Amino acid sequence: MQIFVKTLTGKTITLEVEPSDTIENVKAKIQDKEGIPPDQQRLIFAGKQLEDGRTLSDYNIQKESTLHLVLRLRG
Amino acid sequence: WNAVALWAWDIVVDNCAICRNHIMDLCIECQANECTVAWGVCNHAFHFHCISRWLKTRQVCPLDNREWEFQ
Amino acid sequence: MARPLVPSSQKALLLELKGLQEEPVEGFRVTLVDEGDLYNWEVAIFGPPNTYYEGGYFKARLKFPIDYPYSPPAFRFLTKMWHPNIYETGDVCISILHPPVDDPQSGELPSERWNPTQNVRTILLSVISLLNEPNTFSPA
Amino acid sequence: MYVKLISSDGHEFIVKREHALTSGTIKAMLSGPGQANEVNFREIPSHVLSKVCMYFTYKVRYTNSSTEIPEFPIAPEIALELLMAANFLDC
Amino acid sequence: PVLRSVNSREPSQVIFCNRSPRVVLPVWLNFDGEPQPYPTLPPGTGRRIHSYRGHLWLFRDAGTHDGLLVNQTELFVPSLNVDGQPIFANITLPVYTLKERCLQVVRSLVKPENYRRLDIVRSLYEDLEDHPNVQKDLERLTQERIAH
Amino acid sequence: MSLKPRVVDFDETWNKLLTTIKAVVMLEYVERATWNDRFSDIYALCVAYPEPLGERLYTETKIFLENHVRHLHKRVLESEEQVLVMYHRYWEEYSKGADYMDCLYRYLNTQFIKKNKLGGVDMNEPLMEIGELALDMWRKLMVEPLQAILIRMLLREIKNDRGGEDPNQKVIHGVINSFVHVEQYKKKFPLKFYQEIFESPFLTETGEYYKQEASNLLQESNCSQYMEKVLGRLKDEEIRCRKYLHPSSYTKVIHECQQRMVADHLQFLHAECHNIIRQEKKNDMANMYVLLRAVSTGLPHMIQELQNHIHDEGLRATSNLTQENMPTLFVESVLEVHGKFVQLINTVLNGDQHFMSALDKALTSVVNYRECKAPELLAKYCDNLLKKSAKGMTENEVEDRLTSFITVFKYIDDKDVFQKFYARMLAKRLIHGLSMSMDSEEAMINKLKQACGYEFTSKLHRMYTDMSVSADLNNKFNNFIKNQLGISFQIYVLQAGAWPLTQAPSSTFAIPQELEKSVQMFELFYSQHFSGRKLTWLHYLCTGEVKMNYLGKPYVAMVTTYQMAVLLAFNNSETVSYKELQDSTQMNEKELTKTIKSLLDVKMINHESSFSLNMNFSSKRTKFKITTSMQ
Amino acid sequence: SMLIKVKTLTGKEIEIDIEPTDKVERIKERVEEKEGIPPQQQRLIYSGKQMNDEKTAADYKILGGSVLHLVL
Amino acid sequence: MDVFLMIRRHKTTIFTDAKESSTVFELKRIVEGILKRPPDEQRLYKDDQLLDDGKTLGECGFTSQTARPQAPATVGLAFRFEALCIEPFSSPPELPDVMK
Amino acid sequence: SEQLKCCSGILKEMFAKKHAAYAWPFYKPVDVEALGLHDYCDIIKHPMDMSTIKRDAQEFGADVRLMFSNCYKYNPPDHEVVAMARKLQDVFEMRFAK
Ligand SMILES: Cc1ncsc1-c1ccc(CNC(=O)[C@@H]2C[C@@H](O)CN2C(=O)[C@@H](NC(=O)COCCOCCOCCNC(=O)C[C@@H]2N=C(c3ccc(Cl)cc3)c3c(sc(C)c3C)-n3c(C)nnc32)C(C)(C)C)cc1
Ligand SMILES: [Zn+2]
Ligand SMILES: [Zn+2]
Ligand SMILES: [Zn+2]
């Protein structure tokens, strides 16, 4: 499938992944496509944090959707 | 004859994060009137005028958490 | 008649507002409280579906410093909120809104700290994420 | 426009009715039938009616404005009679 | 009470100048609304005072408590100041009804108890006896504020 | 002077004042001297010595008023059938009185009633200053007793007025306003006696009577006449209310009539709204609008019906069209529908924004109609307007047509397909020169941008900027060459993301010697003057000058690069076969076939096939250019 | 005459056509005419400001293609 | 600068006002409004000497000091011709024995 | 020169609106007549104020310390003025140390 990814640099990109790829794999692909290490990457969809240890099917994200990438946050 | 050959390709826009302007276009501050483009260790492209201010405010790249250094 | 010189911070704020309007961000809307004040913007926060805040409407006030984007703007929720990372006055404790000052004792990385590369949309997304995943390490 | 009050000894006191209408009882005496000018009476001596008229004039001239608004002196001798007359005229 | 000094803790400076021939003792309303006395000011005598922003103060006559008009209103509210210059409040007299003014003259010229010594009816004896209490004025002001 | 304390024979003094006040209250002339003498005696009574008789004066005046108003009630009863007029007379009497006899007792008010008003354990009636006492007792002993009879007769009088009669307006208004005068001097409520004792009965009965009248009109005449007579009734009712009632109830009475003549029959009105609008009966449409505006639930249904009619009319007018001029006929039908119904709404429906919105929705549905066909036709129409084929039209006419096209396109829902057609149309117009006016194209682009943001126009804006940039770069290259190839320079470079005809070639095409030299010079100039993304040579569009010296007269044509190579291939021999030409040109088979066909059509060349140069080829002018027929 | 889309929480972009001088009440009623949401249970959000039922759409600086926020 | 006056004849008395710079003719016009005998019939004095129309009240001795609102001055009256004559008011009462 | 510039910057920061919530009482010298403090002059033998302050940075530091100490000694320990003075002095000491 294909998804939409937005980086902090304003430019927009898309990634071709299946419903079997893991969150870690998606983060690695985003890092390869942009130039940000996975440690300082965070994917947000529908106002919810994307756990690294999961799969796209877990959040039920289909093709043509959008994913928001932000920096590291804490309390 | 006219013929056609165009664009002499040579490799993204590398939009600066601090100013949000184009690489070819001068920085936001320089627009109001020699704005060189400075690249960091992570290869991120940032204008010299905004890169110097960011470094002065804090010695950390805006996108990556690593140090800012040229080639 | 030369037009008044647009400040760099004002131009950056206008560009950010234009980008946000051209690319709507789900879960919130950003608009200026007063047309003549580009440093005072009103943002509406809507609870994401499938969360404890679903169906909620909490207003927030964003104030951008004169040195923007060098310094992160002040973000505080207008509607009364009870969260470990939200103070009674409405201030939001987020590493993104913290100044880029190297604080070894804080435990927050400079990369997670506020940077010029950050944006209002990114700050709103981080706040929304924290609303559902509050950090109890340093409750405010 | 001018009402002609009257005292005991026979004095006739003429004054603008717009001033004289600050006293409720004179306003009543004028608002009745007949026309109600001339307004006669039973007690007041001229020496009390004169002071009441001076109060009427003062109440328009040197008050209701930005100013010092001085005290209009009242002789201690006339105090009782003028108090009773002010009670009657409701001024 | 509805009329009470605001405990904002914000410094405020003022001056209460007496324009009426009477001696005026500035009155201060406390945090709960209870009147609080202040040192008297001689007729034509004025000075500076210290009071936080939002304070509610009134005026009174030195001997008879006869009402005095401060800044063309029953109460004066001092705001914050600029450059340390105290606010300027002017005390001036109201427009007395003749009964009330002659009553005030009788009270000034005859001591507070000697009213029944005078040669008129006991109804106006009763009027004489009423030295205006600040409580009645405060209640009337609260009612007027509620109505308006 | 004033009035002195006195010992007073209360009985005789009160008897004298009693007869005197009697004389004045009954309107009997009384001298001002005597009246002020009564004032005198009243001061005395209220200051009486040794003790004040003010209390007994008040009690005796209360008894006097009770006696008097009871007298007047007995008099009204005795009046039998003249109650309205005689009540009005007594009311004028007693109101003027209790205005006078208030000022006269005003001293007593101040001294006694204002000073003792409250208290006592028993819930006794509070003291009332003389004005309040007089009016309240008038109430309590003339109105409350008769309230039913007065209501009945006043209702009957107003009913006569409705039936065409004209009873005494002054008397009726006075009798209806005394119920509100008796309200004066009490702070509790301003109008409650009148509201709850007249307005409510009168509103009930007027509602009943006009519901009956609505039944009569409906059963008697048709829908149009019914609306007209209902509007007439409402107007006459407003006049009647103004004449008779208190102003606070005008709204309530008119609301009652509207509710009982329109709202409680809205189903028939809605059912016939279909017929009225579908029959474009303008007068009844206006009446229906005015009446249904008075009911919240009315206007939405008429909005729906006008929406449906506009939808159907547009659909019919646009589908019944001939296929000869589909774009122009489509757009003209849409605009004529729009104008007709905008004029109709402004003229007859008061220009209501709701019906304007209905018109907009209906025309949106029509302009997105399909079996998309409508965006296709609209794109074709704007294209045709801008092309050179619109012969005879001036620049102002083109601008007006563009404004109309924008007005029609504002409701185009299929923006994606519209832009898809428009990008190709505009690009073809620009590249081949078919565009009638580049300034007009820029104006249309600006209108589209103002309509739908820069994102929507990105493609067309980029295409126009690219045409301008190609022209500017050609000028700059000419300047650079002059600042230092056998033929001029005219070639195209485009971005593949907007231009739809960007079918870049890939075969090892061999450009002529002059074309190759010019390309080398242009590339050398560009390498130092600019940089960026790479693009393939769009030889299929570029045109250049080729000289045919073999003809009997000189002729030079600015022809396509592929066409130029094909023509130059003839330099080897007069007759050339397809295989030899393909080998010489190195061009794609489809491109070579298209070039051969275009050359045959132009008459330049004549027909495993073989072709020979046309020695009879001629042109209108010695110097000319060939059109890009390689789209 | 303008074209706007009312984005719902799920993600369905409801396209509606309004006038430059339209009213908030009419804009809300349009959603019910095409979405079914009653006008009494709609709270439009635009530029972080709660849409008022009295102010016209021109006071909110609404332009073509603007995404509107509707919360039930 | 205003001047207030207590015009008088016999034991009758009147209350009006004026400006210091006002002419005696203007004051006679005021008396015409009062009486209402027109100015020509009037004949005015202060204290006993006849006034002149052209003279301003300031010239005649009226001043904001001499004719203050609480103590309005006195003007004489006579008509066209007859002499002047003024008499005082009634004597006030006696102070009661308690205030003595 | 550097010490004087740093002292001027610290004074400007103190006078800024950022800390005006607590620096307001010390903007100008205390007005004895307005405050009604008969013994204020006897209590404080050397009055000072931020406006009055506005050899080296040591002199400025000593003046600021004396100004703070005057109010600290005059007012009771639990005074709102004392609390505001302490709040301002915290930032002043932080700036001096930095
Ligand atoms: C002579 C006169 N004639 C007609 S009126 C009058 C008069 C007018 C004003 C005053 C003084 N002002 C007041 O009493 C004001 C008026 C009214 O607004 C209420 N009020 C108060 O002071 C009230 N106070 C407040 O609302 C704030 O409460 C904190 C309580 O402490 C107030 C003062 O303590 C009593 C006497 N001590 C001082 O004044 C010491 C003085 N305090 C302060 C001081 C006082 C309070 C605060 Cl929060 C901070 C600093 C002070 C300074 S300098 C300066 C500009 C100030 C304000 N200061 C320094 C340095 N060192 N000492 C001081 C009250 C009734 C609770 C005492 C005295 C007489
Ligand atoms: Zn970097
Ligand atoms: Zn930059
Ligand atoms: Zn720069």
Author numbering:
A (entry chain U): 1 to 75
B (entry chain R): 27 to 59, 67 to 104
C (entry chain G): 1 to 140
D (entry chain D): 17 to 51, 53, 58 to 112
E (entry chain B): 61 to 208
F (entry chain E): 1 to 118, 128 to 380, 385 to 497, 503 to 625, 635 to 658
G (entry chain N): 0 to 71
H (entry chain C): 1 to 80, 85 to 104
What does the paper say about this structure?
To this end, we decided to investigate the structure and mechanisms of the PROTAC MZ1, our potent and fast VHL-recruiting Bromodomain and Extra-Terminal Domain (BET) degrader, which exhibits preferential degradation of Brd4 over other BET proteins. Of note, MZ1 forms the most cooperative, stable, and long-lived ternary complex with Brd4BD2, even over its close homolog Brd3BD2, explaining its preferential Brd4 degradation selectivity. To gain a deeper understanding of degraders’ mechanism of action, we determined structures of multi-subunit catalytic complexes, composed of the full CRL2VHL, an E2 conjugating enzyme loaded with ubiquitin, and Brd4BD2 as the “neo-substrate,” all assembled together by MZ1 as a representative PROTAC degrader. By combining cryo-EM structures, cross-linking trapping strategies, and biochemical identification of ubiquitinated lysines in vitro and in cell, we determine the structure and mechanism of the entire PROTAC-induced Cullin 2 RING ligase VHL catalytic machinery, and how it operates to catalyze ubiquitination on its highly specific neo-substrate—the second bromodomain of Brd4—that is recruited to VHL by the PROTAC MZ1.
In this ubiquitination structural mimetic, wild-type Brd4BD2 was first N-terminally fused to the C terminus of ubiquitin (G76S and K48C), mimicking an acceptor ubiquitin (Brd4BD2-UbA). A UBE2R1(C93K, S138C, C191S, C223S) mutant was generated, as S138 has a role in positioning the nucleophilic substrate near the active C93 site; we therefore mutated Ser138 to Cys to allow for maleimide reactivity and mutated C191S and C223S to avoid bismaleimidoethane (BMOE) cross-reactivity. The UBE2R1(C93K, S138C, C191S, C223S) mutant was loaded irreversibly with wild-type ubiquitin via a stable isopeptide bond at the C93K residue (UBE2R1-UbD). Within the (NEDD8)-CRL2VHL-MZ1-Brd4BD2-UbA-BMOE-UBE2R1-UbD complex, MZ1 and the cross-linked substrate-E2 conjugate serve as a stable bridge between the N- and C-terminal regions of CRL2VHL, with the goal of encircling the full complex into a closed “ring-like” structure. (B) The ~3.7-Å-resolution cryo-EM reconstruction of closed cross-linked (NEDD8)-CRL2VHL-MZ1-Brd4BD2-Ub(G76S, K48C)-UBE2R1(C93K, S138C, C191S, C223S)-Ub. Pleasingly, we observed enough volume corresponding to the UBE2R1-UbD conjugate that allowed us to model it bound to Rbx1 (red, yellow, and green, respectively, bottom left). Crucially, we observe that this hydrophobic patch surface is fully buried in contact with UBE2R1 also in our cryo-EM structure, evidencing the UBE2R1~Ub bound in a closed, precatalytic state (bottom middle). While Brd4BD2 and UBE2R1 are not in direct contact, nor do they show any protein-protein interactions, we observed that K456, which we had found as preferentially ubiquitinated, points directly toward the E2~Ub electrophilic site (bottom right).
